[PDB]
Amino acid sequence: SHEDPGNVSYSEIGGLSEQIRELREVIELPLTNPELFQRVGIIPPKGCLLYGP
């Protein structure tokens, strides 16, 4: 739970192209406003899968 550390910058390694923006939409924006999705009526973005290397 709360052993969870954090990074000393947003750019702890790099490559923040889709990262900042799409992670920003999938978390922070409907938590700021659910009524925008309540123009449709659905829960917030159901979450990506960080796969690859």
Partner: protein, 54 residues
């Protein structure tokens, strides 16, 4: 009026697909964009993989 059969879970996924796809553009309702984006995103192209032996 379309064929290319789409089931009920697939229909609801198209509707929520399109609604989220317009509200993430900070809009009110889809102006027929994201319905056709939901078609050309959701079908979702018979896989890729393999187009040999059919």
């Amino acid at each position: 009026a379309r064929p290319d059969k789409i089931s009920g879970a697939d229909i609801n996924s198209i509707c929520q697909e399109s609604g989220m796809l317009a509200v993430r553009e900070n809009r009110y309702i889809v102006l027929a964009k994201d319905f056709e984006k939901a078609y050309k995103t959701v079908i979702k192209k018979d896989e890729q993989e393999h187009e040999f032996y059919k």
